[PDB]
Design a protein around this ligand. Structure first.
Ligand SMILES: *[C@@H]1O[C@H](CO)[C@@H](O[C@@H]2O[C@H](CO)[C@@H](O)[C@H](O)[C@H]2NC(C)=O)[C@H](O)[C@H]1NC(C)=O
Ligand SMILES: *[C@@H]1O[C@H](CO)[C@@H](O[C@@H]2O[C@H](CO)[C@@H](O)[C@H](O)[C@H]2NC(C)=O)[C@H](O)[C@H]1NC(C)=O
Ligand SMILES: *[C@@H]1O[C@H](CO)[C@@H](O)[C@H](O)[C@H]1NC(C)=O
Ligand SMILES: *[C@@H]1O[C@H](CO)[C@@H](O)[C@H](O)[C@H]1NC(C)=O
Ligand SMILES: *[C@@H]1O[C@H](CO)[C@@H](O)[C@H](O)[C@H]1NC(C)=O
Ligand SMILES: *[C@@H]1O[C@H](CO)[C@@H](O)[C@H](O)[C@H]1NC(C)=O
Ligand SMILES: *[C@@H]1O[C@H](CO)[C@@H](O)[C@H](O)[C@H]1NC(C)=O
Lengths: 163, 120, 248, 99, 49, 50
């Protein structure tokens, strides 16, 4: 945060400092050799010459027999048919999110919390919010005034850092 | 995810920082706008349980207890009638809290008139 | 072996309306609940489609141009139409494409056939007559596949030749209309893609009695369509972008 | 069409996002719009030029999107200031201002 | 009227659609402004003779 | 050469549209002010000073 703000003193607030990308782990190359399909992980897929990076999950979409790939409104490949076994797989993009640092003033304390925006807590004092996964803040049931805004009705304050 | 593309993109300088800063300013400006419009009272006023207002009926604008969202029938109708590196940040005030702010304003203007806007 | 047919009756070929037929899937990509605009070689809506008859004594086998692509419609009963001939000069000088569907299987051959003036098949009242070509010297591509096939059956085919690829699109429709093309919409599924890589400018449709059949020939033009994909990925409606200002 | 103003704002924002995503499909004069195809098909001396063309096209698209986002943000801020003024003067008091 | 220029211009995508849409929005906004300023009465009043 | 002309003319057109949008925002603000003056000064008597 000091690096991003170009200052050695950080005022109290939330500062978007970086980004997180779930890095790809394996390569799955299925043509009609065929590397053993791996699901529910961020892998680099190559299906019949169509390449990309994504998480391959089960799909409820019933394709017509001549169709192989699937596109949304924005012309991005979100569904595909496995050439070996005629099953439909959804291609969810690998998790990417803003990394924000929630801190009080450096005059007060050096404790920080990290918010991963739009990232589930299982893909990274860990709490799940609608804004994303918040690490380093203790969730309390009490309601106070908003000190540092997190989002979706969630705010953070220093008393340790609570959300 | 191309490293070579990012290396060539670094030659152009701080364009990306400018665009991210502008988008961040817009994103905080939306929350500031919502605070300015709806969060003008620091007291959450509530209507009395008995709705004896001398014949005036406010059921269509007061929150409905039967609904889980605690919205008015008009607000419920309004919510029903409105239908690659991109992220959508959630608003700081959720819809139920904005509805709660409107409910507090309605309770203040019904039970107290314009007095609550100028003081106690 | 070639046989001249000298018992024909002179009659001009007919014309009718295309309505909203001739739409095929432009690619192999699944799309659901979306509206997609594509620019491709399509058949225009409500166009003038040429109508040919086979009735008894009519036997319509003329020489037609191919141009950019051909939409072929068939109001068929009792299986008279058997295949197509594609080429440029239709002799041994150039290389020609043969598509036939006999009683067993569908055969595609790319050879330099010395074609007859009137190529035909025959059914005796079983198939025991085949007079299409007299020779086949240089053959490059062979492909044996499954059989593709009041008027009871409607056959739609789209033949295109782009970048050495011959795209054949097909659709089979149960109908009960007596004389003309039914009015409706049916998107043509892709049937086969053949890497023939040959020049095609002319095509042919494949005593004696002619069974009752009728076929329609339309020509493709480069234009834009707006296709509607439902929740099941089937094209249910289409808009011709250059037909009228409302569809534009 | 009673709620056209909010639906108009939602449609404009969604259309801007859809256009910004759609602009990735354009090659901007390069041989392809896919970075992996360029990196796998060409040597780095000419792939650098193709990637540079893609970078300048996408950067121009992103700057354009940010520019209309800032203009729409100014318009929405003016509308929100008007809404706050109406909330202060019509709801929290009685206004003598005509219309 | 250059066909080659338009073919090269199609490589850049929907910039032209964006510019036309923005100009159309400005053009309808001017008419909306004139309606908001001047068309605030639905009765055409006239002075006595 | 046509690509150079296209990028130059496109940059010019985008610049023109950008200042047109900014001037449109200014004119819209002025028109909103004019509508407010029409409602409050012409169609009624205003207690607002100046
Ligand atoms: C205030 O108005 C509401 C709605 O206009 C009244 O609720 C109605 O009550 C009658 C009789 O109980 C029902 O038949 C209607 O269906 C109700 N309408 C709705 C929308 O629920 C209510 O009775 C009125 N009076 C008070 C004191 O609340
Ligand atoms: C069927 O008729 C066609 C058309 O008349 C015959 O084709 C002709 O063949 C002769 C061979 O000497 C050529 O000189 C003519 O120029 C051809 N005519 C055309 C229009 O191409 C064909 O040979 C006949 N079939 C048989 C078996 O005799
Ligand atoms: C179709 O073409 C024929 C001649 O080729 C013409 O007589 C007929 O009127 C045309 N029909 C339509 C609907 O254009
Ligand atoms: C159909 O054609 C193929 C290829 O020429 C041939 O092998 C087959 O025997 C034919 N079928 C009949 C019934 O003649
Ligand atoms: C085609 O056939 C003729 C005679 O049958 C032969 O002379 C010629 O070389 C052949 N060409 C090719 C390309 O096979
Ligand atoms: C195909 O044939 C036609 C006439 O036979 C000719 O005009 C055209 O140039 C040919 N095209 C190619 C690619 O050979
Ligand atoms: C789509 O398929 C479902 C069954 O999966 C069916 O119930 C529905 O009617 C179909 N819709 C259309 C438009 O064909």
């Amino acid at each position: 945060t000091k690096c991003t703000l170009k200052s050695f003193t950080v005022e109290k607030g939330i500062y978007q400092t970086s980004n997180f990308r779930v890095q790809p782990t394996e390569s799955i190359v299925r043509f009609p050799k065929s590397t053993n399909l791996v699901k529910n992980k961020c892998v680099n897929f190559n299906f019949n010459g169509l390449t990309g990076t994504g998480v391959l999950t089960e799909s409820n979409k019933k394709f017509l027999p001549f169709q192989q790939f699937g596109r949304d409104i924005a012309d991005t490949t979100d569904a595909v048919r496995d050439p070996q076994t005629l099953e439909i797989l959804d291609i969810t993009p690998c998790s990417f999110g803003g990394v924000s640092v929630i801190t009080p003033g450096t005059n007060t304390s050096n404790q920080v919390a990290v918010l991963y925006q739009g990232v589930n807590c299982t893909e990274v004092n860990v709490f799940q919010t609608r804004a994303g996964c918040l690490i380093g803040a203790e969730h309390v049931n009490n309601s106070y005034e908003c000190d540092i805004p997190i989002g979706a009705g969630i705010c953070a304050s220093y008393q340790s850092i609570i959300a | 995810d191309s490293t070579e593309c990012s290396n060539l993109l670094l030659q152009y300088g701080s364009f990306c920082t400018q665009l991210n800063r502008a988008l961040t300013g817009i994103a905080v400006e939306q929350d500031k706008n919502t605070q300015e419009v709806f969060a003008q009272v620091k007291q959450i006023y509530k209507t009395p349980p008995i709705k004896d207002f001398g014949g005036f009926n406010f059921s269509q604008i007061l929150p409905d207890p039967s609904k889980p969202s605690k919205r008015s029938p008009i607000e419920d109708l309004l919510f029903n009638k409105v239908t690659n590196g991109l992220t959508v940040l959630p608003p700081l005030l959720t819809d139920e809290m904005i509805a709660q702010y409107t409910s507090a304003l309605l309770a203040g203007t019904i039970t107290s008139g314009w007095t609550f806007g100028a003081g106690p | 072996q070639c046989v001249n047919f000298t018992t024909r009756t002179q009659l001009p070929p007919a014309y009718t309306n295309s309505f909203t037929r001739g739409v095929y899937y432009p690619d192999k990509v699944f799309r659901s609940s979306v509206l997609h605009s594509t620019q491709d070689l399509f058949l225009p809506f409500f166009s003038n489609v040429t109508w040919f008859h086979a009735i008894h004594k009519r036997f319509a086998n003329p020489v037609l141009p191919f141009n950019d692509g051909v939409y072929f419609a068939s109001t068929e009963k009792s299986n008279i139409i058997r295949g197509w001939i594609f080429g440029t000069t239709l002799d041994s000088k150039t290389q020609s494409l043969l598509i036939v569907n006999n009683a067993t299987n569908v055969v595609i051959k790319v050879c330099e056939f010395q074609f007859c003036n009137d190529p035909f098949l025959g059914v005796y009242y079983m198939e025991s007559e085949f007079r299409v070509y007299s020779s086949a010297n240089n053959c490059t591509f062979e492909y044996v596949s499954q059989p593709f096939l009041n008027f009871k059956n409607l056959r739609e085919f789209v033949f295109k030749n782009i970048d050495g690829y011959f795209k054949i699109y097909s659709k089979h429709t149960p109908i009960n209309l007596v004389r003309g093309l039914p009015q409706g919409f049916s998107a043509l599924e892709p049937l086969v893609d053949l890497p023939i890589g040959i020049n095609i400018t002319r095509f042919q449709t494949l005593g004696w009695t002619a069974g009752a059949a009728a076929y329609y020939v339309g020509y493709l033009q480069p234009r834009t369509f707006l296709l509607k994909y439902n929740e099941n990925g089937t094209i249910t409606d289409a808009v011709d972008c250059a037909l009228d200002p409302l569809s534009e | 069409s009673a709620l056209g103003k909010l639906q108009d704002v939602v449609n404009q924002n969604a259309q801007a996002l859809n256009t910004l995503v759609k602009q990735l499909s354009s090659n901007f004069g390069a041989i392809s719009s896919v970075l992996n195809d360029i990196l796998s098909r060409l040597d780095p001396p000419e792939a650098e030029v193709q990637i540079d063309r893609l970078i300048t096209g996408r950067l121009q698209s992103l700057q354009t999107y940010v520019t209309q986002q800032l203009i729409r943000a100014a318009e929405i801020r003016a509308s929100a200031n008007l809404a706050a003024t109406k909330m202060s003067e019509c709801v929290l008091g009685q206004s003598k201002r005509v219309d």
